[PDB]
Amino acid sequence: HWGYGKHNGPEHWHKDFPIAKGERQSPVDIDTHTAKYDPSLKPLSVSYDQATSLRILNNGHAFNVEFDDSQDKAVLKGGPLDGTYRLIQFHFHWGSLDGQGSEHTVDKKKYAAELHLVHWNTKYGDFGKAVQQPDGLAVLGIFLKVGSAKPGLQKVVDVLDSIKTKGKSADFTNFDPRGLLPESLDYWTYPGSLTTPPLLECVTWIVLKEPISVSSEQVLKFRKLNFNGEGEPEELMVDNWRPAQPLKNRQIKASFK
Ligand SMILES: [Zn+2]
Structure with a gap:
């Protein structure tokens, strides 16, 4: 099954999902000299006040x-x-x-x-x-960088020990995703794809310029998760990222210079 390893990782995905070599694949490198400031780009509207979280799950590729x-x-x-x-x-x-x-x-x-x-x-x-x-x-x-702790992330980090292996889940109600946002909503945007199989070219990407800061203690908890199921040999869930793909003449636009 696809994954992130030497024998099933991003360099192999095109064999089952030929769109992996398509015209609008994600992610990409954002070259800030070639991205175009667009003064017509409006502020983003992120309205999470009434968001209703349900559950957190390890699906074998990340946690959701x-x-x-x-x-x-x-x-x-x-x-x-x-x-x-x-x-x-x-x-x-x-x-x-x-x-x-x-x-x-x-x-x-x-x-x-x-x-x-x-x-x-x-x-x-x-x-x-x-x-x-x-x-x-x-x-x-x-983006997440390492620094001070993000208080709104703490509930997430604290629950991860309960969902270590693929197929595990936990109740996860009353979580407010507003606590994951940085102060600024300045952004880059471009048309792209899912970054996991099936890699469908169905996404408007909006990537915030400002990272959130999380602590070293917080991010270390991510690295304790497992790709494997319970009882199977340990395969630590790290490096679950697809590398940057060719831009192929798409235009990355920015809400700032
Ligand atoms: Zn993703």
């Missing part, structure tokens, strides 16, 4: 916090978007050391981790239908 997307309120809109998108889940990618782990890079710089908040377009009925459309998803990508 799932949300009740049956109603509005928990919505991403504005910015480069022409529709409204409902939050369905978030997850992270991270490294085997603080010096790598992000999927997007900025002038080739890698962050320790990257948070993906995944939202689907309300034109399309549900997530599964939305991913079949070029504008089906809007993913808010947020």
Whole structure:
């Protein structure tokens, strides 16, 4: 099955998912000299006040916090978007050391981790239908750097010991994803793809310029997770990031210079 290792990782994915070599693959390196400041780009609107988290799960590739997307309120809109998108889940990618782990890079710089908040377009009925459309998803990508602790992340870090292996999950109600956002919503944006198989080219990417700071203690907890199931040989969940893919003449636009 696909994964992140030497024999099933990103260099192999094209054999089962030929779109891996397509025209709008993600992530990408954000070259700040070639990105284009667009003064017409509006502020992002992130409205998480009524977000209803349900559960946290280790799916064997990352851990996901799932949300009740049956109603509005928990919505991403504005910015480069022409529709409204409902939050369905978030997850992270991270490294085997603080010096790598992000999927997007900025002038080739890698962050320790990257948070993906995944939202689907309300034109399309549900997530599964939305991913079949070029504008089906809007993913808010947020870099993590190591520094002070992020208080809003602590509940997440604290629960990870209970979901160590693939197929484990825990109750995870009453979590407020507003605690994962940086102060500034300045962003880069470009059209791209899921960064995991099936790699569908259905995403408007919105990557925040400002990282959030998390502590070394917090990020170390990510690295205790396992790719394997319970009872199987230990395979530590680290380096679950796809490297940057060719931009292929897409334009990355910025809400700032
Ligand atoms: Zn992701």
